[PDB]
Design a protein around this ligand. Structure first.
Ligand SMILES: Nc1ncnc2c1ncn2[C@@H]1O[C@H](COP(=O)(O)OP(=O)(O)OP(O)(O)=S)[C@@H](O)[C@H]1O
Ligand SMILES: [Mg+2]
Ligand SMILES: [Zn+2]
Ligand SMILES: [Zn+2]
Lengths: 124, 121, 396, 111, 105
């Protein structure tokens, strides 16, 4: 029994391939092989074209009050600041725009084959 | 990006994760998609750690402990990192060039995957 | 007719008339080995010529009035024929009290002021209340402020609304100028030379050389060096009171690295004590006090208060007291509070030109108001209702 | 630059996690309050009193270089800031960054 | 070497901290009424009984304590075994052992 080889290198070498997120683009917009076995032809072709969110619907839901509580089953301003609130509503608008843009981006790609095609073609 | 001052999952399962990130320019409270909680737990993120979270992907990287906690023990195997200087929320508009081969090789093999076949790959 | 404004601090008494200027006079008696039978009172310390080995007789212990005889003597000297010639029967007095002053001390204050001197009317407030009044007079648009009173014997952080003091959120840090001076003495005595009997000289040294560091560990690394690159290190010549009346710092061009000087000056070399001593205010745990520092205590006091009022408190941080005169104090407080405060809330820290006399100016302003007569408690009302109504009217 | 702790172990205490470690040189002795990661590192590599060890502070890399009562105990300061210089070839950088655990290919071909 | 229990270390810390509040270190040059503790015990001040002197005391800091050398003040990686005092170098350790370790000279 021998001790292992301790190979020592510069700490900077282990960060050679690392790129900060602010310096690289999202490669998930070109991810075709990741959709296989997870995304179906129904989602890409029939569902999403009909049930994609719009900015108007998102804004309406965000601005509207909370929905009324679900019924139980039955067996049958001195301290107000204008600048702070303007900042907060600008932040809310940015957040809603980000939600919309990410929802569009995360369902933009359609599978090459899809779960239905693979299941149909996969014999026991 | 910033030092973690609070990490509280909100139960309905977890509806969302409220995180508190600190920088030299202030503190920000963020509501995270519940899928990021798995990434935060995998990265072993606790209060006092300096992390960054990608808004578009939910990726979490724990890049060490804050150097303000360097004296909490006399001998720990930790990497102590300065508190980030700018704002917690950082926006940058970038132009990156890729070639068609990069997109081809990115789709030749799967990435990640918690299945046994994916891990062995 | 006239109104007397007094800030009975544990170190300096800010005494003056409402229509005149302000005087800073030490509020303690002195004894020296150069005088056999002679106790100096208040500003008589100017008469002594060899303040080395000076003995201090203080009327305050841990920031509260506990010795009544020396305080009575100091008051008699200040109100006597030599200083102000106060006509007690026709004069109103505004005198400040420590925070959370004990019931017994308040009773003794009321009894002494209303019987031994028989003042026409007395208004006992806190120095923070006067500072808040002055700040609101200067800034009429602000609805809330937070006052940091880093004084001789403690450092309180008290938030004030327009006409009310938030008693729930008062936080005290047991680090003051007394502790800093004693710690500097102990450090110098343990490291270079015994100065434990030179409280006056060490206090002047602290006032002259100490500063608050923006980068603590960079400054420590700079101080650890030897040679030209050690910019923090300076040489201080202690006063011998024979040819050097007052202490001074040698110029950098005249500094000698070896430390030996042909002139027989007693030189005290301070490198890391310049910012280690002031750091106790921001980090009490450096020396062993398990208490939060000034910025964290400010943030804690604000965050205890309701959410709607927090941004206003963050916008009106006011630094008062002697310890606030350290170089870099305001910038350090602003940087630390900015780091801890939420990014949506703006942070503004204001250091007045004379933080020592802020409370006296506030007292003068409150004396000039037309609502002054309603605040005070009269002697005629004192006879019957006084001992309760003194507690009732004064918001101590 | 790295911080290297080299000394002789005097006493090691671990309790259900908190721990203490006492190290000595021929000129000074010290007690350390240990963190969780260093406690785990010292548990994985059996360290007992009398062993002469060196610790890389940032990584917990503990290597036992003998026992003393055989290598003589270190003399000077226990904690030393050292300048470590590595000359790394471009091939080594490429192989290390080629894949996870890719540095193994520097020894077994398989690049 | 000898070892001091927790009570001794806490007593030394309390004694050093209380000495920082002393008015003077020497005695009266003339060589020939209450105190703060008497005032506190007379006030009969109870915790959680509204805002008062005791409840106003600042709580423990969140940031951990930073060790400094008991001899020169620079940061100290080392802790003295016998008394628990911090120190940074062999010279500082020798000075501490000769001056303030065990017997308090
Ligand atoms: N230029 C200066 N630099 C540093 N400290 C200073 C300076 N001038 C005065 N001090 C300190 O200021 C303190 C006294 O400030 P004050 O607030 O006036 O004390 P005091 O208010 O009379 O006592 P309290 O705390 O109100 S009971 C002393 O500890 C001095 O050492
Ligand atoms: Mg005062
Ligand atoms: Zn030292
Ligand atoms: Zn010791």
């Amino acid at each position: 029994i021998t001790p292992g080889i301790c190979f020592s290198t510069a700490s900077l070498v282990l960060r050679a391939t690392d790129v900060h997120p602010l310096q690289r683009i999202d490669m998930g917009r070109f991810d075709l092989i990741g959709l296989e076995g997870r995304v179906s032809r129904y989602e890409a072709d029939t569902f999403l074209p009909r049930h994609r969110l719009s900015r108007r619907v998102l804004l309406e839901v965000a601005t509207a009050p909370d929905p009324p509580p679900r019924p139980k089953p039955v067996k049958m301003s001195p301290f107000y600041l204008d600048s702070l609130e303007e900042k907060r509503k600008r932040q809310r608008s940015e957040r809603l725009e980000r939600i919309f843009q990410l929802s569009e981006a995360h369902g933009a790609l359609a599978p090459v084959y899809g779960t239905e095609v693979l299941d149909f073609c996969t014999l026991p | 990006e910033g030092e973690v001052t609070e990490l509280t999952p909100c139960e309905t399962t977890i509806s969302h994760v409220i995180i508190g990130l600190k920088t030299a320019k202030g503190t920000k409270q963020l509501k995270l998609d519940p899928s990021i909680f798995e990434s935060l737990q995998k990265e072993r993120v606790e209060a006092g750690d300096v992390i960054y979270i990608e808004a578009n992907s939910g990726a979490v990287k724990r890049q060490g402990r804050c150097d303000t906690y360097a004296t909490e023990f006399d001998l720990e195997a930790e990497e102590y990192v300065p508190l980030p200087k700018g704002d917690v929320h950082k926006k940058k508009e970038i132009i990156q060039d890729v070639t068609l081969h990069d997109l081809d090789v990115a789709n030749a093999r799967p990435q990640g995957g918690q299945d046994i076949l994916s891990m062995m790959g | 007719m006239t109104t007397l404004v007094l800030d009975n601090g544990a170190y300096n008494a800010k005494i003056g008339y409402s229509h005149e200027n302000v005087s800073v006079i030490p509020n303690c008696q002195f004894r020296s080995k150069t005088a056999r039978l002679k106790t100096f009172t208040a500003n008589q310390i100017d008469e002594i010529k060899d303040p080395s080995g000076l003995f201090y007789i203080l009327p305050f212990q841990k920031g509260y009035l506990v010795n009544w005889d020396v305080q009575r003597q100091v008051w008699d000297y200040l109100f006597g024929k030599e200083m102000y010639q106060v006509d007690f029967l026709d004069t109103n007095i505004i005198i400040t009290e420590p925070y959370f002053n004990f019931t017994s001390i308040q009773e003794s204050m009321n009894e002494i002021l209303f019987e031994e001197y028989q003042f026409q009317a007395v208004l006992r407030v806190n120095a923070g209340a006067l500072s808040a009044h002055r700040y609101f007079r200067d800034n009429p648009s602000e609805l809330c402020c937070i006052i940091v009173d880093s004084g001789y014997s403690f450092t309180h952080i008290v938030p004030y609304c327009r006409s009310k003091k938030k008693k729930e959120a008062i936080i005290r840090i047991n680090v003051g100028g007394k502790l800093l001076t004693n710690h500097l003495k102990e450090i110098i005595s343990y490291r270079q030379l015994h100065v434990m009997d030179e409280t006056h000289v060490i206090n002047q040294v602290k006032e002259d050389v100490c500063y608050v560091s923006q980068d603590f560990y960079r400054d420590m690394d700079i101080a650890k060096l030897k040679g030209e690159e050690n910019t923090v290190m300076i040489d201080y010549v202690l006063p011998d009171f024979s040819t050097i009346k007052k202490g001074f710092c040698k110029p950098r061009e005249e500094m000698v690295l070896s430390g030996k000087y042909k002139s027989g000056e007693q030189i005290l070399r301070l490198a890391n004590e310049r910012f280690a001593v002031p750091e106790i205010l921001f980090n009490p745990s450096d020396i062993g006090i398990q208490e939060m520092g000034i910025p964290e205590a400010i943030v804690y006091s604000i965050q205890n208060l309701p959410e709607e009022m927090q941004p206003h408190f963050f916008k009106n941080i006011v630094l008062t007291g002697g310890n606030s005169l350290f170089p870099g104090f305001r910038d350090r407080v602003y940087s630390e509070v900015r780091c801890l405060t939420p990014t949506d809330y703006d942070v503004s820290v204001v250091l007045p030109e004379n933080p020592i006399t802020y409370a006296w100016e506030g007292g003068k302003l409150i004396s000039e108001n037309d609502d002054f007569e309603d605040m005070v408690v009269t002697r005629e009302d004192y006879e019957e209702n006084g001992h309760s109504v003194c507690e009732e009217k004064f918001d101590i | 630059e790295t911080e290297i702790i080299e000394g002789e172990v005097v006493e090691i205490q671990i309790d259900r996690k908190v721990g203490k470690l006492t190290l000595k040189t021929t000129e000074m002795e010290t007690i350390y309050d240990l963190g969780t990661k260093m406690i785990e590192s010292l548990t994985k590599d059996k360290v007992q009193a009398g062993d002469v060890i060196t610790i890389d502070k940032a990584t917990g890399k503990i290597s036992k270089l003998g026992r003393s009562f055989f290598v003589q105990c270190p003399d000077g300061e226990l904690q030393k800031r050292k300048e470590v210089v590595h000359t790394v070839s471009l091939h080594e950088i490429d192989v290390i960054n080629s894949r996870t655990q890719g540095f193994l290919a520097l020894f077994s071909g398989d690049t | 070497r000898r070892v001091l229990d927790r009570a001794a270390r806490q007593r030394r810390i309390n004694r050093q901290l209380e000495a920082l509040e002393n008015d003077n270190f020497q005695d009266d040059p003339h060589a020939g009424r209450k105190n703060f503790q008497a005032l506190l015990e007379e006030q009969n001040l109870s915790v959680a009984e509204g805002p008062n002197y005791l409840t106003a005391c600042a709580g423990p800091p969140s940031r951990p304590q930073r060790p400094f050398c008991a001899v020169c003040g620079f940061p100290s990686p080392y802790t003295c075994v016998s008394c628990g005092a911090r120190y940074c170098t062999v010279r500082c350790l020798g000075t501490h052992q000769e001056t303030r370790c065990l017997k308090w000279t």
